[PDB]
């Protein structure tokens, strides 16, 4: 009648029972402490603080500042000599050929 000879389902294990100072990494306290130290050092003191410092001081990302500064020059050109600020044609009309129509 006893179909499927099977080990009984084990109960849940509480990590705080055998070690009340468990961080939740391993049941061995020294390995758990060292894993906690490694995670908190290389997860917050290395890749977050120094990572955010590296991202904050990026050297002119996508030249987003430079395109401003050159524009600051360029307007000061065409406002000085009476030229229009921007032409309606991106390319020069003299160097482009149209099909006959």
């Amino acid at each position: 009648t006893l179909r499927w000879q099977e080990d009984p389902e084990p109960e849940d294990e509480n990590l705080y029972e055998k070690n009340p100072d468990s961080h939740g990494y391993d049941k061995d306290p020294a390995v758990d402490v060292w894993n906690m130290r490694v995670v908190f050092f290389f997860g917050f003191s290395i890749v977050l603080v120094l990572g955010s410092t590296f991202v904050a001081y990026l050297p002119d990302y996508r030249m987003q500042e430079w395109a401003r500064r050159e524009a600051e020059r360029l307007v000061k050109y065409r406002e000085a000599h009476g030229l229009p600020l921007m032409e309606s044609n991106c390319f020069d009309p003299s160097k482009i050929q149209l099909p006959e129509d």
């Binding site: 390995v31 997860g43 917050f44 890749v47 955010s52 991202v55 990026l58 987003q64």
Partner: protein
């Protein structure tokens, strides 16, 4: 890109030659070091993309996905070292090797300058994911979840390869740098119609699209925590990246072709949000929210405006981080109460205050509270789709309400009210779990300060 592939491949001699119980520490440490070195890919120029060699190149679109993947691997190892404490040492090493191999294929997928190489890695990501889901899951239905996840994707991707090979016989090359200058307009014909279908349906399947999304609620709620993270935060962005790469060749036929899929996604977001309003499972709720957000990304890519592309990539990164955090929250609750029912464990704020704070913060970032990048992406997609048509805002706006109708609901049933009386195994929050949620959230909150690094290749 050889400076990132080689340490990732060397992670396997690290995890196989390690000690009896030092595999997790060494793998987490060295993967965090790889994540630290991943920031060198931010050498982006306003006109030129970063080209490394004839095989690997990195634009401003693949770079946030690469950084997210190499950041996600240590979080994955931290998440998946509690339900495997009873596992065999060889099986534990096999699981870690599976995660390392999957991450290697992911970081080799995004940098591929050839569409055939990209497609090869894009299907090579299937095998470790399927193995993880079908081997280290918990329920029976994972076996069924091993089929719907597989034979959907290949059914979209096996025609597409043929279309890609056709380009190899038509344009002479499949290199993305060459195809940006040798592209040709696509005339309206039935042949180009079916070539558009072949080139798109794989990315509609893997995003997923409403109607074709049936594999995602099944492959999210039987999979383990690491599998849920890899499906939610990375593997749904392969479709978006493939769409953004392949939309260049499919012009100008996309203007009248994108209509039925746009309508499908615009109704599927409402349908999936309404489904989220009545789901009895936390994991299924997160899966359907992922379906809704990826339908929004599908609309953004299909209307193909610069604001839409910017909102699409911002939404991709933000949804990846938020869905990963929500899945880790669900995993912690499942590990504490040993069930997936939403209504079972109520009033957890009176027992876990810090986990209640994390739940509130994750639900806050889910409904796109400004100035988070979720609101940035969703807002820009809304602006672009209002430029597309003036009525679609209604189909956006109502959806927003339903989002705020379930996320807070997902808060309340899990956090507020009278606690249940017959549950008395509620342990205090471990340091590992809190470390996991802080590592999930603090980059997401920090990215609001400088979002210009996740605004696509046309910022």
């Amino acid at each position: 890109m050889l400076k990132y592939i080689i340490p990732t491949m060397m992670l396997m001699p690290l995890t196989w030659l390690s000690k009896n119980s030092m595999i997790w520490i060494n793998t987490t440490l060295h993967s965090l070091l790889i994540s630290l070195t991943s920031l060198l890919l931010l050498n982006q120029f306003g006109d030129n993309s970063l080209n490394f060699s004839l095989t690997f190149f990195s634009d401003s679109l693949s770079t946030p996905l690469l950084i997210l993947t190499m950041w996600l691997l240590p979080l994955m190892l931290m998440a998946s070292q509690h339900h495997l404490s009873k596992e065999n040492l060889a099986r534990k090493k096999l699981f870690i090797s599976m995660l390392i191999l999957l991450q290697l294929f992911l970081i080799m997928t995004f940098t591929a300058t050839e569409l055939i190489f990209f497609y090869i890695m894009f299907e090579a990501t299937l095998v470790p994911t399927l193995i993880i889901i079908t081997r280290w899951g918990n329920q029976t239905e994972r076996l069924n979840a091993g089929l719907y996840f597989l034979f959907y994707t290949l059914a979209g991707s096996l025609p597409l390869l043929v279309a890609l090979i056709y380009i190899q016989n038509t344009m002479g090359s499949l290199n993305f740098l060459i195809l940006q200058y040798w592209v040709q307009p696509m005339p309206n014909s039935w042949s180009n119609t079916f070539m558009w279908l072949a080139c798109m349906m794989a990315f509609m399947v893997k995003m997923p699209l409403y109607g074709l999304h049936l594999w995602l609620p099944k492959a999210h709620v039987e999979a383990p925590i690491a599998g849920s993270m890899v499906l939610a935060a990375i593997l749904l962005k392969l479709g978006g990246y493939g769409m953004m790469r392949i939309t260049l060749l499919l012009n100008p036929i996309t203007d009248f072709m994108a209509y039925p899929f746009i309508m499908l996604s615009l109704w599927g977001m409402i349908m999936t949000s309404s489904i989220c309003l009545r789901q009895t499972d936390l994991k299924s709720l997160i899966a359907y929210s992922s379906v809704s957000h990826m339908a929004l990304v599908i609309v953004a890519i299909l209307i193909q405006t610069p604001w839409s592309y910017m909102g699409a990539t911002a939404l991709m990164i933000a949804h990846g981080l938020t869905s990963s955090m929500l899945f880790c929250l669900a995993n912690s609750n499942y590990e504490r109460v040993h069930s997936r029912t939403m209504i079972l464990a109520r009033g957890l704020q009176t027992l876990l205050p810090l986990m209640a704070a994390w739940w509130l913060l994750a639900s806050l970032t889910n409904l796109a509270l400004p100035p988070s990048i979720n609101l940035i992406g969703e807002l820009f997609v809304v602006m672009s789709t209002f430029s597309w048509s003036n009525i679609t805002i209604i189909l956006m706006g109502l959806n927003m309400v339903i989002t705020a109708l379930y996320s807070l609901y997902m808060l309340i049933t899990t956090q507020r009210g009278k606690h249940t009386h017959h549950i008395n195994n509620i342990l205090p929050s471990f340091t590992r779990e809190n470390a996991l949620m802080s590592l999930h959230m603090l980059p997401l909150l920090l990215l609001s300060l400088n979002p210009k690094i996740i605004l696509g290749p046309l910022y």
